[PDB]
Structure formats: structure tokens, C-alpha cells
Design a binder for this molecule. Structure first.
Ligand SMILES: Nc1nc2c(ncn2[C@@H]2O[C@@H]3COP(=O)(O)O[C@H]4[C@@H](O)[C@H](n5cnc6c(=O)[nH]c(N)nc65)O[C@@H]4COP(=O)(O)O[C@H]3[C@H]2O)c(=O)[nH]1
Ligand SMILES: [Ca+2]
Ligand SMILES: [Ca+2]
Ligand SMILES: [Ca+2]
Ligand code: NA
Ligand code: NA
Length: 270
């Protein structure tokens, strides 16, 4: 496993961040086993994207197996960012702090409110958590430009963005600019279900014809080569998948694959 500075916060994160999301098929013991496997492969960055009791029980128990300061724990809030408020803070206290048995979160990752300002009551609550040392930073998940006035908010330490083979110029520009301005950037959607028909496009044959590599592993390897990303979010349903994803971190993408990735759009256009 490889590790990267999380922006200018002074802490480091594994190159992969494991997303944990509600799934009735996974009970507490399964979640514990998944987190243990991730930890044993050097993943120290986890994003909780759910609030089911089985998930919180199993993940919280697994997190407790290691010293807290070695973990980077992010809580994802997917509600409409302009509607967040005291109800959100109460739920966070119940699910994240009580549910995971935590005294602090490293990051709270919200959506872009499409403005320079956050809702007042919610922001006051975040300021209380930060002053109480219960929250180290706020992150903004965006698929567009973020208002510079929101990024200038003293709470904000990070942004998240899709990043994959198909990312266009604007998405790449935003990621590079955020990183150059000392925000940590979390990559998402390295190979999302809705993009995978790319493997059928002329010019992209290498995704499925490179000896020793699968399409998904090439796409993860590509995301791992982007210097602007502090970490790449992944989801795994079983221990074998976690082991395979972590293994990609230590593989070198072949030079010929990198060349074909760079030529692929032109070849597809032609
Ligand atoms: N990197 C990243 N960025 C994310 C993610 N989720 C949301 N965003 C970003 O945050 C913006 C605001 O989302 P919102 O506060 O949920 O506010 C949303 C929400 O109120 C609504 N919306 C979006 N998708 C749906 C949907 O499927 N159903 C419904 N009912 N409303 C939706 O439209 C608003 C505007 O959405 P957008 O134009 O997409 O703008 C989104 C997008 O730029 C994520 O996981 N990763
Ligand atoms: Ca839930
Ligand atoms: Ca205030
Ligand atoms: Ca925006
Ligand atoms: Na993320
Ligand atoms: Na993911």
C-alpha cells in the first residue's frame, strides 16, 4: 500500500479509501471482516456512506482494533446541502459518534450547496464540533465548479470529484486547481457501472486485451496515477475484492497501456 498527504492537513491517507454503504446482505460480522481485511492490506481511510445498525456495529468494532490516530474516517452526508440543519447534526451524533463509538471524525463530506454559504444552523453546529475537537474538517463533493467563497471557509479541507478515463477537461482542471490550492481531493467513480460500455468503443480494446490485467484494474491503476488525488474511493463486497483492489496499488501500469489510454480518445474519434 502507498500513502499520500491529505492536502495540507498534515496527515496521510492510504491511496485507496474503502466506502462502506448500507446493504442488507452484509451483517455486522461481515462488515467487521471487510474492515479487518482492508486494514490488513494497509487501507486506513474509510468512508461511511450509510447508517444501518449492522454496518455501524461491525465497522465500529473493527475500527477499535487499531489506534484511532492511524485511521482517517469520513462520514458522507447525501442530503440536499441547502436543507441541512439541526436534524442533520442530531442524526450525526446518533449514527456517527454513538453508532461508530467515535470521539471525532476526520472529515464530513457534504454536497455542493451551489453558493458561497452553508445553511446557518448547520454551519454553527459544524463550528461547535470543530471547536470541540470532534470534527477535523469539512469536504465538498462536487461535479462542477465550487464557489471560491465556500472553499475559503475555514472548515473546508477537502473536495471530492469523479475521476476516470472519461473525465473531460473541466473536471481535470477543477481537480488540479483544488490540489494546487492545498485541498485534498478524493477521487470517485474510477470505473462506475454506467461507464463500462467504454470497453466496447473502438480505441479502447486494450481495456480487455492486455495480458494480466482486467479492465477494472486498468481503470483503478489509471486513477492511481493522477497526482492531484490524495486517495481513490473504492467499494468492495467481499474480502477477495478488497485484496485485489489493494494489490493494484503496488502494480505498475504497463507503459504501452498508458500510451494507449492517452491515444484512445483520438483513436475512437477516428
Ligand atoms: N463529486 C460528487 N458530487 C456530488 C455527489 N452528490 C451530489 N454531488 C454534487 O453536489 C451538487 C448538489 O447536490 P445536492 O445538494 O444533493 O442537490 C441536488 C438534489 O436536490 C437534486 N438531485 C440530484 N440528483 C437527484 C435525484 O436522482 N433525485 C432527486 N429527487 N433529486 C436529485 O438536484 C440537486 C442538484 O444536483 P446536481 O446538479 O447533480 O449537483 C450536485 C453535484 O454537483 C457525489 O456523490 N459526488
Ligand atoms: Ca440507511
Ligand atoms: Ca458562527
Ligand atoms: Ca457548484
Ligand atoms: Na468520496
Ligand atoms: Na466507490
Amino acid at each position: 500500500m502507498r500513502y499520500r498527504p491529505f492536502g495540507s492537513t498534515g496527515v496521510a491517507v492510504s491511496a485507496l479509501t474503502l466506502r462502506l454503504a448500507d446493504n442488507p446482505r452484509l451483517r455486522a460480522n461481515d462488515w467487521r471482516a471487510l474492515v479487518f481485511t482492508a486494514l490488513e492490506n494497509g487501507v486506513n481511510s474509510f468512508q461511511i456512506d450509510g447508517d444501518a445498525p449492522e454496518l455501524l456495529k461491525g465497522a465500529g468494532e473493527a475500527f477499535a482494533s487499531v489506534e484511532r490516530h492511524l485511521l482517517f474516517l469520513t462520514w458522507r452526508l447525501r442530503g440536499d446541502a441547502k436543507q441541512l440543519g439541526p436534524h442533520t447534526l442530531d442524526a450525526l451524533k446518533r449514527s456517527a459518534f454513538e453508532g461508530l463509538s467515535l470521539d471525532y471524525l476526520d472529515l464530513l463530506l457534504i454536497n455542493d450547496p451551489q453558493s458561497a454559504s452553508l445553511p446557518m444552523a448547520f454551519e454553527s453546529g459544524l463550528q461547535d464540533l470543530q471547536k470541540g475537537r470532534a470534527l477535523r474538517g469539512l469536504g465538498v463533493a462536487s461535479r462542477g465548479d465550487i464557489d471560491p467563497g465556500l472553499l475559503a471557509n475555514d472548515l473546508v479541507t477537502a473536495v471530492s470529484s469523479p475521476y476516470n478515463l472519461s473525465s473531460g477537461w473541466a473536471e481535470r482542471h477543477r481537480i488540479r486547481q483544488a490540489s494546487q490550492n492545498n485541498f485534498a481531493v478524493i477521487g470517485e467513480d474510477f470505473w462506475p457501472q454506467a461507464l463500462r460500455e467504454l470497453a466496447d468503443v473502438g480505441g479502447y480494446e486494450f481495456l480487455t486485451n492486455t495480458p494480466g490485467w482486467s479492465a477494472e484494474d486498468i481503470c483503478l491503476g489509471y486513477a492511481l496515477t493522477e497526482p492531484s488525488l490524495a486517495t481513490v474511493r473504492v467499494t468492495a463486497d467481499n474480502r477477495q475484492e478488497i485484496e485485489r483492489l489493494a494489490a493494484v496499488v503496488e502494480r505498475d501500469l504497463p507503459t504501452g497501456v498508458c500510451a494507449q489510454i492517452e491515444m484512445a480518445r483520438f483513436s475512437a474519434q477516428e
